[PDB]
Amino acid sequence: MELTEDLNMELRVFFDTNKSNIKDQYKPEIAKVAEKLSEYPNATARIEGHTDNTGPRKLNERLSLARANSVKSALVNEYNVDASRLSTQGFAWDQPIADNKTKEGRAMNRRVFATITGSR
Amino acid sequence: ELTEDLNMELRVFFDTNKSNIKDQYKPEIAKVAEKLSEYPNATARIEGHTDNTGPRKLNERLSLARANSVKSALVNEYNVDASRLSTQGFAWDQPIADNKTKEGRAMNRRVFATITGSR
């Protein structure tokens, strides 16, 4: 007998300008991700952070990575997920998903998108 | 967004001329029923086969009887809705082993069921 269940999950977290903290509104989503990572012990997560295009380049390279690491930290420290199962990478303002010329668009760009995949 | 995809393959083997489900296969059939409940939209494609010995008509009926035997166990013993399960017999047309050997023929007298679903 061959039995496989494949998990596919996408997480989206947004941040305030120049901030890398996890706003309470996203805790329920992060909790759901931790739950599935427990339900699928072999699953891994690709966490990628981003920034809008305002401010010094290096500040944003660092900030984008800090955002991705903030999500990883929440999973690792609050939910005890094995750190090695999660990758983090920052892309500064290089991959926008919205218009940087508006407040709303910049808000969409200050984000962390994570893809969780794996089978059991 | 979140999704879970189910992919299962059940393999049941039969003795010459037989289409009964040997008790050793009940645990696996039980597992299939469990997953069909966990993934309510799942369906199964049950395909029966025979080795190349005997009349063509015997094997056309036997291959299908084997597939239906698996379907019947799920429907009657596990209350699985019949419409979610398709059955088809291929006689000896799709061997997976050499019919020249005893063990090869044993492998060919089978029913392979593919279960797919998502939630």
UniProtKB/Swiss-Prot annotation, chain A:
KO phenotype (gene knockout): Significant loss of the bacterial outer membrane, not as able to induce apoptosis as wild-type bacteria in human cell lines.
Annotated ranges, domain OmpA-like: 2-120
UniProt: meso-2,6-diaminopimelate binding residues: 18, 52, 54, 60, 67
Domain of life: Bacteria
Cellular location(s): Cell outer membrane; Host mitochondrion
Function: Functions as a porin. Induces apoptosis in human cell lines through caspase-dependent and AIF-dependent pathways. Purified Omp38 enters host cell and localizes to the mitochondria, which presumably leads to a release of proapoptotic molecules such as cytochrome c and AIF (apoptosis-inducing factor). Binds peptidoglycan, contributes to cell wall maintenance.
Miscellaneous note of the record: Live A.baumannii and purified Omp38 elicit identical effects with respect to the induction of apoptosis in human cell lines.
Family under the similarity heading: Belongs to the outer membrane OOP (TC 1.B.6) superfamily.
Subunit field text: Homotrimer. Forms a pore with a size of 1.3 nm.
UniProt domain comment: The periplasmic domain (residues 221-339) binds peptidoglycan (PGN) and diaminopimelate, one of the components of PGN.
Protein name: Outer membrane protein Omp38
Species the sequence originates in: Acinetobacter baumannii (strain ATCC 19606 / DSM 30007 / JCM 6841 / CCUG 19606 / CIP 70.34 / NBRC 109757 / NCIMB 12457 / NCTC 12156 / 81)
